[PDB]
Design an enzyme around this catalytic site. Structure first.
Site, short mmCIF file in Angstrom:
data_model
loop_
_atom_site.label_atom_id
_atom_site.label_comp_id
_atom_site.label_asym_id
_atom_site.label_seq_id
_atom_site.Cartn_x
_atom_site.Cartn_y
_atom_site.Cartn_z
CG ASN A 13 1.07 4.70 3.51
OD1 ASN A 13 0.06 5.24 4.17
ND2 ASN A 13 1.26 3.64 3.21
CB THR A 36 -7.86 -0.59 0.32
OG1 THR A 36 -9.44 -0.20 0.63
CG2 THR A 36 -7.47 -1.29 1.65
CG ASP A 45 -0.28 3.41 7.53
OD1 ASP A 45 -0.33 2.29 8.69
OD2 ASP A 45 -1.70 3.64 7.04
CG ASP A 83 -2.13 1.15 1.21
OD1 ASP A 83 -2.56 1.46 0.01
OD2 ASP A 83 -2.49 1.76 2.34
CE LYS A 104 -2.91 4.96 2.19
NZ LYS A 104 -4.33 4.83 2.45
#
Ligand SMILES: CN(C)[C@H]1CCc2nc(NC(=O)c3cccc([C@H]4CCCN4C(=O)Nc4cccc(C#N)c4)c3)sc2C1
Ligand SMILES: CN(C)[C@H]1CCc2nc(NC(=O)c3cccc([C@H]4CCCN4C(=O)Nc4cccc(C#N)c4)c3)sc2C1
Lengths: 395, 365
Positions: free
Chosen positions: B199, B226, B212, B194, B196
């Site tokens: 994060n 998500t 994250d 994930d 992104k």
């Protein structure tokens, strides 16, 4: 951070602590034992914990002390909840006496607290009068106490194998007095003083072995107990009288048992012996009329005086005004030894030992206990391992 | 095995911070046991009553001694996730400024999510990399899981992309920092799954750090495991190549302004990712890299990504990239500056809700 942290480190390191390194592992270990069952495993939380900790706890179990680390030579003794066996540590090759305590028989009844005092006394006494505890460990079935081996056996064996003269009786009675005073200075009443608990080392000197009935004295040196403890013959009238209401007694009760020991040493029989166990109860309560001495007497005036002085009603008993009252009795006035150097002098019976695993002073007993009962598979969390968490000790 | 080798190995197992059975993890067990057993219905059991009478008082003493939420003064809430919130805190004693992440044990138990935090804890605490947000302390109570991490005053890349029209000079820097950051995660044996801008966090210097890690997963045999940054292989076994897809999705959004698979309906995005050959619609080498990651690059190693013409520049070098001046350096007034940040039931029997959290407590040094 600065205000508090230093205290936490001490709590984890301290051997007398309830939450030290070894005691915390006991908790994790007990949790695995008590939860790993199919019915309990159905719970997502219980399965989550066991899947993460079962493998590492098995690794722990292999690393920490186990019954497999000791080679059992032979069973030398047997009590209510277990047996004492002579063991040799497989790695160090050191010879010890290992006491086993059945977790099943302990849970079946209610006795799951008696061993705490014994563990504490033996492990932290640091006295030549107390049998030293080197290691304490456990598994799902037993509590193990790795203690020092007493090769001279018990006083029961000595009294049966020898016609104990007054010179020997003076030595062993005095050693018991110094031994009990050490337990009293630690803040405890023994409550079960008997020749079965008096063990002899390689030198032939006395050491108290079992402390299961020990109870911590209050600021007045008194104790409150609703249930009577001890052994039918050596029990004092005040402890025998115990019931819900009047169960109030001090250290004087242990001195009664010293007199019971001295009588049996010189006569050959216990003072309140009866063919029926209820007959003994009435004899102790009526010590004013039951205490007699055989017509034939080779035993001294001062020996009978100490026996009668101890074998009286709690209030008029000798030793009510301290140990010095006992030490100053005419029976202990001798030429061979002195109170302060008594354990340094030569013992009357020095055991003739051939090997480090010699058991001549211990009578052979039935090795097989048949088939010991194991806890039934629980349908829900019972937690039978919880009252034993914190028993593990290392030196 | 055996003596004193077994005793030595045991001592290491209790001292090691990476160990599942160290000092701090064993106390968690005793603490959880007290929380889960101290109820009148359960106390009826002689064994449960025997344990509680013997350990309740000392555990309360330990709870007071050990790190607690009371030790931290909350400045303000800087973030919020599915099972908790991230708040800027100041430790009352040391006066040190941190970012504290809370995770609701009740929300975690209600669903089934009680394992996602283990990877995040492990990564942050044992990374020792300038690309990973450091975890200084991890603690817990009956209600939450606390993560005391380093504060990132520069905020996230979402805030940067909304506050600036990111040129290619800046886009080259932030993409390269993500590449080095992800390679560090891969070398640790983890797959992000994930990646992104939410994060991607920036420090006081203005340099990137991954934050994250809830979606992380440890590699198996050698390197196998998500919206809208999701790769077609995850969306539907794969390797580290799924994280490189998200890098291309980040680079496209940095230069265009919208995600390459953005759809007005969330179901529309799912279909767009699966048909990337037709759905994927200002420089030559920039477009070449976006199409390189958006396949089915990073298949062999990280060196093939590093050697692309888009990363060929005069301003920085791969080995000294974090030592160079960042494009956006946060203008900070105080140690608690937040300008870059936009503003249970009583059981009738043993349930053991505290058991999936045993072993979470960590103290670096
Ligand atoms: C009713 N409640 C409240 C509790 C009162 C206290 C108590 N104590 C028990 N104790 C036992 O169950 C037990 C088990 C094995 C051996 C022994 C002794 C009795 C025979 C020998 N022995 C012993 O401890 N020997 C020993 C000790 C130390 C070193 C050596 C050597 N060498 C030998 C006792 S059961 C029980 C119930
Ligand atoms: C479905 N399953 C399998 C699981 C998949 C992984 C997962 N992760 C969750 N995670 C959370 O519940 C959560 C709580 C608070 C904040 C944050 C993030 C999202 C917003 C910001 N944030 C964050 O961690 N920020 C952060 C981190 C480090 C330093 C600083 C600073 N300064 C800020 C996430 S819930 C959940 C379910």
């Amino acid at each position: 951070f600065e205000t508090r942290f230093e205290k936490m480190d001490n709590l984890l390191r301290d051997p007398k602590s309830e939450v030290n390194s070894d005691c915390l592992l006991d908790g994790l270990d007990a949790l695995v034992y008590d939860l790993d069952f199919p019915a309990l495993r159905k719970n997502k939380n219980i399965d989550n914990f066991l899947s993460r900790y079962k493998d590492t706890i098995n690794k722990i179990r292999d690393l920490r002390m186990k019954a497999e680390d000791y080679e059992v030579v032979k069973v030398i003794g047997r009590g209510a909840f277990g047996e004492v066996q002579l063991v040799r540590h497989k790695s160090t090759r050191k010879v010890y006496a290992m006491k086993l305590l059945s977790k099943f028989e302990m849970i079946k009844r209610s006795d799951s607290a008696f061993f705490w005092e014994e563990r504490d006394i033996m492990a932290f006494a640091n006295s030549p009068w107390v049998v030293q505890l080197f290691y304490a460990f456990q598994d799902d079935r037993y509590l193990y106490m790795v203690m020092e081996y007493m090769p001279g056996g018990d006083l029961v064996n000595l009294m049966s194998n020898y016609d104990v003269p007054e010179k020997w009786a003076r030595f062993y009675t005095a050693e018991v007095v110094l031994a009990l005073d050490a337990i009293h200075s630690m803040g405890f009443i023994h409550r079960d003083v008997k020749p079965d608990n008096m063990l002899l080392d390689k030198s032939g000197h006395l050491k108290l072995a079992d402390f299961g009935t020990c109870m911590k004295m209050n600021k007045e040196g008194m104790v409150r107990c609703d249930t009577a403890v001890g052994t039918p013959d050596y029990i004092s009238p005040e402890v025998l009288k115990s019931q819900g209401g009047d169960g109030y007694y001090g250290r004087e009760c242990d001195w009664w048992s010293v007199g019971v020991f001295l009588y049996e040493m010189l006569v050959g029989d216990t003072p309140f012996y009866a063919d029926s166990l209820v007959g003994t109860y009435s004899k102790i309560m009526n010590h004013k009329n039951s205490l007699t001495f055989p017509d034939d007497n080779d035993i001294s005036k001062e020996a009978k005086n100490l026996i009668c002085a101890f074998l009286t009603d709690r209030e008029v008993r000798l030793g009510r005004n301290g140990v010095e009252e006992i030490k100053r009795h005419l029976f202990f006035k001798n030429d061979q030894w002195a109170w302060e150097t008594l354990r340094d002098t030569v013992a009357p019976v020095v055991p003739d030992l051939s090997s480090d695993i010699d058991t001549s002073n211990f009578d052979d007993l039935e090795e097989d206990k048949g088939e010991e009962e194991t806890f039934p598979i629980p349908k829900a969390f019972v937690g039978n391992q919880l009252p034993f968490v914190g028993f593990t000790y290392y030196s």
